[model samples]
Structures are given as structure tokens and as C-alpha cells.
Target chain A: LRVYVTGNITVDETWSIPDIPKKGASIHGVKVSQDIGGKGANQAIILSRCGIETRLIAATGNDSNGAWIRQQIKNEPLMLLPDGHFNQHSDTSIILNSADGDNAIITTTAAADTFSLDEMIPHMADAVAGDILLQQGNFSLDKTRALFQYARSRGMTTVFNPSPVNPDFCHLWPLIDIAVVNESEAELLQPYGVKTLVITQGAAGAWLVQEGQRQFCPAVPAEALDTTGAGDTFLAVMLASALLRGVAPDALALAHASRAAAITVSRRGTLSAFPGSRELAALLT
Target chain B: LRVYVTGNITVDETWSIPDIPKKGASIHGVKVSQDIGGKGANQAIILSRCGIETRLIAATGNDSNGAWIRQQIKNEPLMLLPDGHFNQHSDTSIILNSADGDNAIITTTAAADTFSLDEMIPHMADAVAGDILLQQGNFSLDKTRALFQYARSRGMTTVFNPSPVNPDFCHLWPLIDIAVVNESEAELLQPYGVKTLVITQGAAGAWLVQEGQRQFCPAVPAEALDTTGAGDTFLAVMLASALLRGVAPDALALAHASRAAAITVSRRGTLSAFPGSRELAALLT
Candidate 1:
């Protein structure tokens, strides 16, 4: 009855300027936006927004952003397990959104970097056989290995988004029930032995592969402003809606998730830019 | 009884990368912080923190940042006059805090660029003859001229920080009661006539000149980090206390403001980084 997401909530500070300046000179930006997001955080929030019970086991600093992290999810149906020892340093991203509307991000993996296997395994106390376990790549690879192995031993369903695709991700596939990845990541991970593999092609569409049988679905049309958090949104809706419909999700569910993600790109920011109920319900129609 | 500041409330998105990227290549950042700060917003909030009544006449868009602006200022005693018509664009700054705590900012003067004289004047109805009116260069020169002239005619006091020092600033001399500017701006205006002039020499100290008289005060020692709104904080505290004490602010008052700002410089971000009551009181003493 619950969706358990390994979390990575961070403060995202974005500065929208006219252009990326040349070195040795200065310029003024026109707009600035700030919000809390990381793939785990965004995916969890969307999962809840689509009307699911979610518990996010995350990390936060003892600073102001950590305090505000509580407010961002105040009314949501999500339960939080933010590690306060994350006080050592909290995660943050400063993005440059220049004239081209393209963003370049510089992130400080502060709190996330400190999260280890020991601190996280205890939270999995209640993770049972049928629970849905979600995760992404922000955590250290050692913890990634531990999380997947633990989830499998408990007989829980595991979903992984191998973004910022690491060099060592191939070893973790045996523990995954489903592996959702982007096109570039798929290029490297293809022909792997995951039970079911989902590859998302930006702008083109998404595919579901099972035992060498591939099913494809076209992408949702969106006038994308910035493609930052599209994948996280895509996967959240995919897992929540598909699993609730009483089956392991397939390519059709992948397209529905893509539709929700398309809406996210059409707007701005990350989790805050996700669609509301009326619009989301309409998009699915 | 009140300090009225021309407003420019904006989202300040900063990425404190390990180093500013070289011309063609990109780099990584370690920390990113965001808060509501514009020259006017910083000055006015500093004024309120100093235990004085403050009214900020500013502009905000209907975007996400606008709603956030309201929430940020909700609990503070400060009043806001954010122009909703400022929808054309929003004011934002993306600062690169690199190279041993130094910073370079890129800002877009979106809403502030549309802040005309008309949108600002109606708020002056409650302004008293003894009120202090503060302004900087974000507003158009035409509006700058109109606002200061009206304040002088109403017998209200005027303080100007002609930052980015425009050529037309020199012509507004006779109407200026106090001119707070940096060294170069002081040089551009030194030969002209003003009632009193204060010059901030970044790290060395500040100089005060009144006709043939001059006084200099040493800067409060600080390990500088991101000197973005240091000047605005310096002037805001100067005006808030000096006027409330029922005296014309002089070089000594300038030193006190400089001392308070020293504590601000040792930290990060504007407005949010300003010293709390105990720290500020400790600095003032």
C-alpha cells in the first residue's frame, strides 16, 4: 500500500540571465528562481500528487534550506525521513539559464555524499515483499549497491533510473525488477539482462523491452522550455499509475508518464513546475 | 517616522562554484543559495531589522517568484508595494562566487526596468515631511529625478546611492541631501555641489565630505565573501538610524553602518546573511 523512495532533496538556485557571459567581464541577470528538487525528491512528489501514499527517506542539512524542505511537502501525503546529521553539508545546485533557455548546473553533493549504507538500511525495516521501492543516481554507488541488494532480499519491487550514468552501474542490474534509463544511458546499458528494461528517447518516445521483445510508444508533444526534470516526472507517473492498475508497467504506461513529463517541460522549474490535477487528468485523456 | 525605499524585489540565485568557468569551458560549483534581494529590498529589510518602520515600493511578476516574494516578507514588519504589471519580465541575478570568495554577477533588470515614476508616486501619500526616501540606479534616471524632486518639495529627506553611476547623476546635485556612492562615483560627482557626500572605498574604509570638511573611518575587518549587497546594507543602516535619531547622518554614522556590514561580508547571500539582533548589537557596540 506504500511507495518507498530513497530521497535526495536539494536546494536548486537558478539565475536567468541574458547570456552566459564571457570571461574577464561582468553582466546582470534578469530573473532568479529557487526550489527544492533532486530526482528522488521530484519523483516522490509527483507520485504523491498523482494520489499515492509516499514515504521519502531523504537527507537535509541543519541550515535554512533543510528547514524549508519541510514546508515544501507540508500538505502532501508524503512522509519524510530526512537525516539531520546531513548537517555536515547539504546539497545545492546553481543553474545558469541563459538567453538560449538552456541550463547548465553546478551541484554540491553535500548531504547526499555523506549518506551511507548503515544509516539507510535501518529505514528499510518496514519494507516488505510487495512494497514499491524507487531510487535514482544521486547517492554514492556503494549505497546504491546496498539499497538494491537489500530491496531484493526483502522481495520488494525495485525501480532504478540510472541517470548521470555511472561507469559501474552494470553490476547492479541483477537486483532490479525494472530499469528505466534515458537514450544515452540505454546506448551503454543495452543488451543487459534486466528482467524488463525501459529506455526513454527524448522527444521521440519511450520503449519497454522484455526478453529481447521491444514495445515502443511515441512521445508526448510539448513545447519544452527546459528539459531538466522531465525524466523524473515521467517515471513517477509511470510507476504509480501502472502498478496501481494491477500489473508491472509497460510501454503504454511509459507513454503516460511521458505525457506528464511533457507538461513539466512546457512550464518551468522542477517539482514546482509539475502539472496540477485538472491539467494532468486532462493530459492523460 | 518611516523609511521609504524604491523597490526591486527579486530572486537571487547564486552558484558558489569552486571557480568561475574559463571562457570556453564549464566548471563545477560547491554551493548554491537563493533569497529575495534587490538593491532596494536589501536596503529596506536592513532598515526594518534596525528597528525602524519601512515601506518598500517595488515590482513583482505573477510568476512563481512573485508568490514566493510575498511569503518571504510575510512575517517581517516591512510593507510592500510590488507592481503586478511588471509582468514583462522578472528581476534576477546569477552570481558566480569564485576565486577566493570574490563574485561576479549577471543580472537581468526585468521588472525594475519597468518601474516608472507613476507606479511609485501614489505610495507617497502616507510619507511624512520627516521621512527618509532611499533610491538606487535600478530605476530610470527620469523617475529618479522626479521622485527626489518631489520628496524635497514635500520637505522629506532624500538619500541616493547612484550605483553604476550614470552620467545624468551629476545633474541631480542641488536636490540631493546626502549622496552615498563608491569611490569612482564620488570622483564622477566630486566637482559638483551636494549637501553631504559619503564615499565607500571597498576594504580600506569610508570617507565623508561636507563642503570644506572631511572625515574618514577605517573599515570594519571582515573576511569578504560575495560582496553583492554590502553597499546597500551599509547605506540602509546609515539612513534608518541617523534619521530616527533626529539628526543628519554624518561620517560617524557611516562607520557604524560600515561596522554592521563587516559582519555581513564575513557570511554569504544578501539580506538573509545580515547579522541577527545579538550579532548586530555586538557589532554596533
Candidate 2:
């Protein structure tokens, strides 16, 4: 029951602009904030909180912000590389908030772009047969392909969230045991024979596509708060449930996972929105 | 024609969470971002874009993050303080974003807390009579008071955006030639008798309180975007309009300034959301 989480660790800078402005228009009265975030870190946090043994293998710079990010995650079982010459520059996202609780974001991939395939080797060496390898689309394509091949050879159950939609990773799909993608991504990959897929459609629920079967599971209705981390939480719950019940990657389990992710989207902050075991059980009930 | 901006500037790191989580829940799907930002820098940008001659006087650490922040604001007119120690740590903010475009923030006032009255005096020496001195609540109360007193003594028109609601500055009301605060801030300083006061109420409109006269102006309606720097833009526009028109700090001029502020908020970003001279004329017409 070990889960090895891999992806980029970014520092998100969000600003609470009282309202969003048009192009070239100036705005006033805004509050700015920065926080530790990344798709990989978020999933790791969720998996760990779900009572699973999770290990985070990531790289960070020797800078204070990088160290601060590490310190923030000190409570989590994260295995960070030694502070060294690697660009400590993390990915950044600028979010603008409106009074009505709506936002727009501009993201710059700084340090995340530098992650290479060789970085994945040592971490993969720790993977065992029964372990689950959790990954997202934050790493280099070559590295992702290499890691996917390694995980398959070691008999590890590979969970892939091919977000940020890169076509280069299409070759890695066959090795993925459970491929979780949003509706847009599913549409993009429909031409491929990847049948075991979870297509998330915010509020409308999720479409679970599998061999010879397809199912739609409605998302639990709740006031939409911040929809930032819903997908990551869904992935965590799906992985946890699959591991717990020994449920083969099927439409039914994917449906349940979609519901779990829906629960997250209804709240705020990616990993922080993950439901606990009791909450998950109650939702199932 | 020289506008000196004195206040905090720090490297802003943001983590984008999927959505704001429920109280006491750990979130999962979040992305991180880092950038350079501060109220002072934001205002400088607005003023610069508005075609005003602007200069920024701020302290930053010697660290690489501080260097990055410096590079970010390099295009703006700036005066660097050699003695301003670049502490390894600086202020950082964490913003949690929700799906509906809402956010919440927590900040650590690290190096921003170190700005002192003595350090600002030398920066003030570069100022002369009739110049506009802009100050905000990004520094210590004592330092802000000293800077305001110095600026006023030098015959500079002092404008203050008493944000983050500092009750300690209630005694310094008369030192400010123009005090721009939102409705909540106005209420917070109700008894201070702020002679020239402007209160912004987002889309509902704005109010001008001067010499026992109150003028309310409705906001120009537009599709709202991000309201991040609306207030700062309002302050800049109001100040620029006053400086350009030689408005005698009376309610009539403040009313026009209020209109400019209102229009800016209807857009997005700080400087980018500001209305051009043409747009302002049409709104007034």
C-alpha cells in the first residue's frame, strides 16, 4: 500500500483583486498572496491524508522560498533532493479574485520546465511490485515515458493524470493502469484506444469510459467555492478506494472517484479539500 | 512632476489551490506561483502607465529573490537604498482560490516589517516642495507617521491610502492632504474627521467627503473582471487628476476623481484597468 507521488512543486502567487479589469484597464484595491502548491504536491497531500503511506519525490532549490516550501510540507512524508545547483525556481500562477468569487489566472512555468527524465530514476528505484506510482503531467515527456516503463516492469499500478494536455505523452498511455482526465482531455484522446478513462465534467458529473462499458456519476451538489484542486482530490480518492477494495480499474470505481473529486471541487485549496476516511464513507453511504 | 512611492516590495509566491476548502479541511489540488509584488510597486506601476513621472523608494533584501523583484520593477523609476539590508526572509502571502473565482489569504510580514523611519529619511531628502508623496499602510506605524510629517513639512501634497485598517494612524489624519479609503475603512475611521475623504464601494458607487460636504457618484457599469488593484488605480487616477487640474482638495474635484476611480474598477489589474483620458471624458460627458 505504498504510493510514490511525482510531479512539479510550484509556488502559487494569488491576488485578491476586488474585480477583474478588461484588457489594458487599470484596477485598484487588491490583496496579493503566495502559497506552496503543485499538482504533484497536492495529490501527495491528499493521498497522505487519506491514511495511505505516501512518499513525495521532488526537487527544490536551495533558496529560502524553496526551503520555505519544504518547511511547509515538513509534516508530510516528502523526500526532497538536497538543496543544490538545480534551478529552485518553482512554477507560478497569478490568480485574480473578484467580489463575486470568480477569478482568472496567468501561469508561468519557471522551474517546472527544467525537470528531466534522469531525475525520476532514483525515486523509481524505491518502487516495489505492490506499490502505486502516482504521476501528473508536470515532468518532461522523456522522463515520464521512462518512469512509466519502469513502473510497468516493476509491476506497479500506475495512475496518470495527463493534465496540461501534451501530445508527446500519448505513448505512455498503454502503460497507465488508470488514466484520469477531464472531459476536454478525454475528447482529445478519444481517437486513441485508451478505454479505461475517467472524464470529469465539472458540476455535470463524470463519464467513466472502460472496455465495453460506460457510466455517468453525478457530482454531489454544493455551493461552488474554489474549484482549484477538485481533480487532484478525485484522483486521491480513486486511488485510495481502488487500493482498499482491490477493485480493478472499472467504470463503477471511476464513477465513485469522480464523486469524491466532485466533493473537493465544491470546496477550496486543492489538497486541503480532500475528504477524510469517515467523510468518504459517509459520502458512499 | 516626480512622484515618490515609499513602502513595501517583496517577492510574491502564490499557490493555486483547486478551490477554497471548508473550514478545518485539508485541500488537495493546488498549484504554486511566485512573483514580485507589493502595494507600493503596484501603485508605482499604475502611476507610470498613467503617463505620470514616478519614482519608487523601497528596501529589498540582497537575496536572489530580492534581485528578481528588483528586475521585475526595473522599468519603473526607482531609487535603491544601499543600507537597506536584504534580509534572507521577506513577506510572503498564501492565497487560496475557489472554483467560482474567490480567494482567501494569509501573509507572513517578514522583511517588510524591517522598514524603519530612519531608513526612509535619506530617501525623503531626494524630495522637494510641491512634489506628491504617496504613502500606504505597508510599513510600521511610526515610520509612516514620520514620513508623512516629513513630506508635509516639505510642502509636498501627501496622499494616503490607509489600508489594512491601522487605528494607530488615527492621530495623523490632518497630515494627509487627501485620504482615500473604501467604505469599510471610512467606517473604521469615522471619528477621525478626515477633512478630505473618499470612500469607494465597489460597483455600488463612491463617496467624497470634504469640508462638510458629501458627494456620491455612481460607478460606470461594465462587465466586471478581476478587482485586484481597483482601489490603487483609483488612488492614482484621483491623485493624477488633482495634480493635473489643480483641484483645491474640494468636494467637487474629489467627486470627479471618484468617477475616475469608479470606471477603473469596472476593468482589471492595477494600471491596466485605469481609464484613458478619452474614456474618462466620455464617462463624464
Candidate 3:
């Protein structure tokens, strides 16, 4: 079973406006909605939907949104932690749109910031050797490093998305087994000499660098709908493919992962965009 | 009292990352939060916070988020339609952030789209003859025209924010007593012969046009914190300043409103950023 641990889990509420608004002008034709989303929740959902034995470990508030999150994951093999309970506040976001589909957002991190590393330790114990540990930059980097080290010590292959790049990770990069970043992040990690790196370029393609071997994966042509979850979907598929094939963490594996992500961008929504094993096989062929 | 009737009331959820993420990588070390927002709701809150007798006429769902919206407006003089009477969904937005505070967003308009002309009629009837009726482009153009015509026929000043600029509103410009848009929108409405126009530019200032005569108002000098509700603040303050001083809906009054909004962008949050009467008095002085 693959273990995905995320510190922050949020209920994503989105509003699609017909167009982006002018500074002072009000917008019309705005549609609003809520979905169960978080880096961990989204990855877990994608992996599970792809027929993987995946479990998610994270904290949630005890509020109504938390209840909604729980109800959303009832059937899934998810481990709920009481320590991350939210009461009056939850992590929230706001999105503004334009007719051309461009958007800007403002967010507040109330309960999401309160998540702690101590809460994550018990769940980490359940992660055994050979299991894949997938993590993103939603938790403390120190805690992330600790978790990555723990997973590595137990022989788990660690996949890290060192997003929201900070200098704190200058020392942590060497510890990451597989580091997936975009073109901009590649520039940031150039000095680290991390053996395995995947850089994603939307619609264009992706680049894979492993042990001085580099390869390019072309993006599949499709009308770009909502690009919101394309990245997360890509990471989920890449991890799934790598684990399923027992492929060593290398350039070829990263190329396959990039192709899987390209497939997801052709669709809409996050977890819903992940391709199944048969679909992946067909695409690869 | 100024009554603004339109669609697009929503809750904004924001997740603040320590830094912006690269294309494919997910980052850690951030927080998440939700706030009361939407074009219409934001404008109403701005007006109310500015000491205007403001009333919000919109529909929301019976969901927890909708209930939260009600609680958010408790201090303001606003009326909400009974829960569950409207659509089950509400507008929700997701915001992603970077370390530099730049952000991206995705939104879903759930219940906000279902607001109809019938629901707006009872709300419109509450407005007195001399009160200003502010409307935006969040609802159907047909419904907006009907509401504008009704407000005009009742001797109320109609301020229109022709946002989410669609081509269908070419005929609607004639009905607007005061048309406020941004620079791009001003370009879109240039051929329509809008007599009273206000075009806002971020950090620079605003342009006012009336009877082909134009004047410029320099925005107050302040560090641009968040431009989220600056425009709404402008409209609300403009309308309030006009009504308080009994100034006609002309370019000069609109310029004063522009100044009011300039004060808001220097701060944070949408409605909360609007200056109180005391602050406005000091700024105006």
C-alpha cells in the first residue's frame, strides 16, 4: 500500500467567473462550488481511483467543512487524525476569474497552519519498507526532512515535490530520492546535484534528468480546460507508474510520469483527471 | 440608503504558501483560510463598512458555507433569503500562494448563478425613490436590464459596473445613470456613448468621463497591499459620498469615490479595508 501524508487538508471552494473583473468593477455570471481537496487528499484520491491501495494521513477540523471532508472520504482507506481538528476556522481560498479563464486568488491559512509534526509520527510508523511515501511542501520542511529520512531508513522510496521553493531546503534536496519541479525550480536546484529531477512544462512537455541522463516527454495535444489539478494528477500518475513497474527512480520513469500528467491536463478537475493503468498503457503504446 | 442587487456572493478560501511553487512541484510551509467575499457581497460589505445604509439582496444555499456567509454579515445591515430556498451550492474559491504573496486561484460558482429576477423584485421594492441602486454584471444581462429599467423608472440613480464585459450589454449602457469600469472595460464601452464613466487604474488613479468631459483623480499614495476589493470600495465610497453630500452622479463625485477606493488598496482584505467615516474624513481633509 502506498502511504501519502499531508499536513494540510482543506475543502476547496471555487467560483468560476465568466471573466476576470476590473479593479473596481463587479463581475457577473459567477458560479460557485465546493470540493474535497488538499495536496494529500487529492493525491490519495487520484491513487485510489487509479486502483492503488492508498491511504491518506492528515488532520482536519471538527467543523462542518471537516464533516464534509470526512463524508467525502468515508469509503476510501483514509486515516483520520483528531489532533488536526478545526473548530471555528478552516483553511480557505478565494478565486477571481476573467472571461478568458485567467484567475487570481487570495487565501487565509487558519487551521491549516496549526498542524504539527508530532501528530504525524504515529501514522509514519505504519509505513513499512518498500512502501512509497509521497509528500509535498504542505508541512514543515524540518518535519518533512524527518519523515523523508524515516521513510528512507525504512527502505521506502521517497518522492518529494519541493514546491514553494525556500532556502531552508538547500540541505534537504540531497535527501530527496526523486525531486519533481517545474522549469523555474530546476534553476533553483541546479547547484544541488540531486541525481533524479523532473521538470514539468505545461502543454509544452517535461524534462527528466537522472545520473546525467536526460530525456524529453512530449505533451499530448488537447484543448486546455481547467489547469488547476494537472500538476497534482501528473505526480500521482508518475508515482503510480513507477511503483507498479518496479522501475528504478530514473530518467525513463520521470518521462513516463510526465506523459501521465499531460494526459490529465487534457481533462478537467484534479482527482478526476488521473488516468487508469489501462489508459496509461494505451497512451504509452 | 443604497441597494445593490446582483448575483455572485461567495466565500473565498486562501492557502498562503511560504513561496510560490514551480509548475509541477508542491511546496510546504504555508497556511489556509476563508473569508466573506464575492463581487456583490464585497461591494455590499464595502458600502456597509463605509457607514452607508447598505442592504445585500442575494440568494445563498442551506449549506454550512452559506450559513457562515450569514454569520459574516451579522454586524452589517443586510438581509439574507432563507436557507435551502435557493440552490444547494454556493460560490466557493480556492487560492494558491507564493512566498512573494503572488497567487493563483480556481473558483466554482454553485448557488450564486441561480439568482433570478423574481427573487430580486422584492428586494428592489424596498429601495426608496432617491436611493441609489448599484448593479453589476454577475446576473444575466436580461435580468440586469430589467432591474436597471425598474430602478430607473422608480426615480432611483442606477450605477452599473459593466464587468465581465460581454458584447450583449451594448444596449444596456443607455440605461446606466453612472457607468464604472476599468481601463480595459472603458475601451470596451467607448463606442457606447456612456455619459458618466469612471475607469480605474491600479496604483495610478482613476479617470472620470461625463458628457465627453474627462477629469483625472490621483490615487492616494499607499503601499499596495491587496487590490482585492479596491474597486468595490471605490463604488461604495463613491455612492456613499454622493448620497451623503447630495452630489449628482457626475464625474466629480465619481472622482471622490475613486479617492476612497485608493485608500482601501493600501490595506488588506476587501470590505474590511474600506475606511470608516473618521478615516475618510481625515483623508478627505
Candidate 4:
């Protein structure tokens, strides 16, 4: 089944500063870097690179940042269905990383917040029954609810990653077929009613809960330089494996996904750090 | 006399939200707008529009935001001197304005923080004796100190606006020829030893202090809508008048600045709110 990922797109600008400055203070930043990042974009890239037919439904403001994101992903393997009708600034993240490895981030979701069922319907024109729909917490609650209802009506398998965890996400569990979360997210999202639940714990491993059965896969250890896209890589790989196997991935499949994520953290950056189809061929098989 | 305004350039993105969201909470913003803003760019735009020969020395990251900033100001009247050598992200400000008019801002000064005496020297190549240098607290204290020293060594008059106030600003006072601040700033800076001091008070008026003598100008009454660029307009007009009249602006000139500032507050946005040369012709005379 084709995988559809709907989420936010953002220009993530990171500044390496000496320290976090106090209010009314001035300090020099050692360096700055810009990257195209967002859960939707990240997961779509990984899924597409894993030889899956992935379509990314996202919205970008009619601004340079939006244009830049399009330019950066023009040659990627996925089909990008971006909405350009909004005049808002693309969702943007300002990340301040101190020399001591502390991080403070501020993000504006103006363009992402513009996502509505109306804007998303056209992008899903080619969606068919049994297709997989993946989403993150980047859209408004009402919009997300509408999206899930419409997808279910079309017999789509709904996968939800209720990240940047909102308190109201539990209410959407009934509409979701699969729920993917991290360790901390699992704590709050437990007692969820989704058919399948996947929880990722850094280094320790991952857990897959399905049909009243629990399976655990220990993580693959590696010299990790950056953990930027590790979770997206894990989720994308895990979802792809389940789709391939026509059922929830077992412990062995979880190991494959964990190994791919380890490869991601072994490098630096977001999209640049993820392994491609060639490197992930063994895991896909 | 050419007016040299040196400081930061940022792509300011303002999101109008219903209310501020708590940590890990997501909410929808009503609208979003982007503007070319920063104290340096604001003051220079105002000065240029007032028929003054203005030069703006700043740096923008080699990114789409930087390109967008250049495109926006390409047709402006001032001469822009930008350093394109840095691989940093352009300085940016994300402002969240709630419906109730409260604002929360997070800014990254990566590009501007890249400024140094080395990067600023080439831009000041044409600066001659008796020129006017306008500055803000956007630069590092050491960089600002070097800039004032260089301007002074060249016999150029130095004007400073210690905004987004930092604690080390008072140390740079002896090198500054003129100081312009708001009432709140003046409270913390009264003991400064600048040759000329100007304090602006919203609605109440402005003060010009020189040689132990003080002069005040009552603010011009106006139906203010957005006070975004008012202070920049005031300082730019006051500096331009001083240059045109070959001395520090007097009470009448301060009134002219106040009147021009009133025009700014009577509208909205940044550069768009400032009066053009044609609109300020009478004030210039």
C-alpha cells in the first residue's frame, strides 16, 4: 500500500552559541546552520528512500523559506504535494545550541496551522482503500480529527504519531489504527485503544504491542554523533516493515528498524544522516 | 554628511495567535506576516527616506531569508553594504502576538553575531571625517567598541541607541558623541557621559541634553495604530536634521522628528510605516 504522510514543513535554523544569554544580554554565536526539518518531511524522506511509494502532504508559506524547502527536496525520491495557497511564513524553528550541549528551541507554526481538511483533501485525490496514512501533531486538533475521519471513511490504515505531545491526543486514539511514540510519550499514552502501539527507548531498544502481545527488540549500539532523525528513521522503517509483512512487525523486524536508526544516529544532521535504500537493503529484505 | 547605520538585519516573522500556548502545547495562530526589521535596518530605512545620504552596513546569512531581505530592500534609497562571506543562518526573530496584543519574541543573532571589526572595515571605506555613525546594541560589545573607536579616530560623530538594552552599554558612552534612548533606558543611563543625550518618552515627548543644558519637545498628538518603527523614525529624523543643520538638532528639529514619528505610529508595519522623502520634505527644510 502507498504511504501518505501529512505534516508540517519548517526551516530549522540552529545557532551554536557560547551560552544561553539572559534577558537583555548580548552574546556571540559561534556558528549557524539551516536545515529542512519537520516530522512529516523526515518520515516521508525515510519511507521513500526505503523503496516505498510515499506521498508527502504538507503546506508551506508563500515565502523564501518555503521555496528553499522545495528546492532542497526537488530531487528526493518521494512525491511532494505541497500547498502554496497560504501567505503565512512557513513554520520555522530557531534552535539555540550552547557549547555545553544545551538546546532551547522556539518554533512558529503559522503555515502548518493553516492546514485544514479543505487544503488536505485535494492532496489525497489519488488515495485509495487500504492505503496507509501517517500523521503527526503538526496540524490543528479539528483538522487532524477531520483528516482521520475522512481517511477512515476511505478505508485507509491510519498511523498516528502524537508528538510534541498534546493533552487532547488521547481522544483521537479511537480513530487511529496504529500509535507510535517514544518512552516518555508511552507513559502518558498508555491505556490507549489503538490496534497497534510502538514505543521507542533510546539505547535500551524498542517495544511493539499488538493483539495483547508484547515484543521487545534491543537497540543496536553505535558511535552516535547526532540523534536528530533517529526516531523518524525508526518509525518509518518499522512502519515499512509491517506493511511489507502484511502484519505488525515482530521482534526481529523491530531489530531491523532499530539497526537502521542506529545508522542514522551514527552520523550528523537530519535528512543527511538517514540511510538510503542501498544501505538499508539488507534490513528491507 | 553621510549617515552610517551599522547593526543587524533580521527577517521578522510575526504570528497572530489567539493566546500563548504552554510548553508542549500546540495552538493555531490566526495570521502570519514577515517584514525586514532590526534596529539597524529600521533606522537606516528611515534616514534614507528622509533625504539623508545613508549607508547600512550589515550581514545576512547566505540563505533564502537573506536573499529575501535583499530583494525587499533592493529598491530602497540607502546604500547597503552586506557581508556575504558567512555560512551562518540569517538573524531571525519569531514574534508571537496574541489577540490581546501581548508579544513574546525569540531571536537568533547568528548572522549579526558574526560581525567583527574585520568584517565591518570594508563597509566603512568611504566614511570620511565629520560623517555621522548611527549604531544600536545589536553588535557584540567588543565589536561596537571598535566601531565607535574607528569612527572617532576618523573624526566622525557617533550616535548610539542602546536598545534591547545590555548591561555593558554604559562602558561605550565615552566613545559615543550622542546618545538616544527611551525614558526607561534613560533611567538606567542618566549617569552616562556622552557629549549629547536624547531621551524619548512615548506621548510625553523627547529631551535633548548637551553641555549640561536640557531641552524638551512635547510629542505630536496622533491616532497611533502600530508603534513598530516609531522610535527608529524619531532617531533617524533627528540625526538627519542634525546633519542637515550642521549641529545637534534643536527643540524645533526635535519636534520635527516627533511629528515624523507620529506619522509612523499612525500606521502599521516597519519600513512601510515610515514617511518617504516627499512626505518629510517640509521637516527636512
**lDDT winner:** 4
Candidate 3, B195-272: lDDT as tens digits:
567787756788777777878887777677565667777776776666667665555556667677767767665446
lDDT of 2 by residue, A1-285 (tens): 788887777667665554443322222333355666778888887777666788776666656657667777876544554334355566454545554453555444446566565665676676789898888887778778778788888999888888777877777778787788887776665424554677777678777676867778787777567777777777777676666677665555556666777677666665455566667766544
lDDT of 1 at A214: 86
CA lDDT, every model vs. true structure: 0.74, 0.65, 0.64, 0.77
TM-score of each: 0.66, 0.55, 0.64, 0.83
Top candidate when judged by DockQ against the true structure: 1
**Which scores better on TM-score, 1 or 3?**
1
Judged by DockQ relative to the true structure, which candidate is superior, 2 or 3? 3
The candidate 4 chain A region of ten consecutive residues with least summed lDDT is A22-31
Ranking by TM-score: 4, 1, 3, 2
List DockQ, one per candidate, in order. Answer: 0.20, 0.04, 0.11, 0.18
Docking class of 4: incorrect
Specify the poorest-scoring 10-residue window by lDDT in model 2 chain A: A21-30
Chain B TM-scores across candidates: 0.88, 0.79, 0.82, 0.93
- The per-prediction CA RMSD against the true structure, in angstroms, equals 6.8, 11.7, 7.6, 4.2
C-alpha displacement of B44 in model 3, angstroms? 3.2
**Looking at candidate 1, what is the lDDT of residue B186?**
76
lDDT of 1 at B152: 84
* Share of true Cα-Cα contacts across chains kept by each model: 0.35, 0.00, 0.12, 0.10
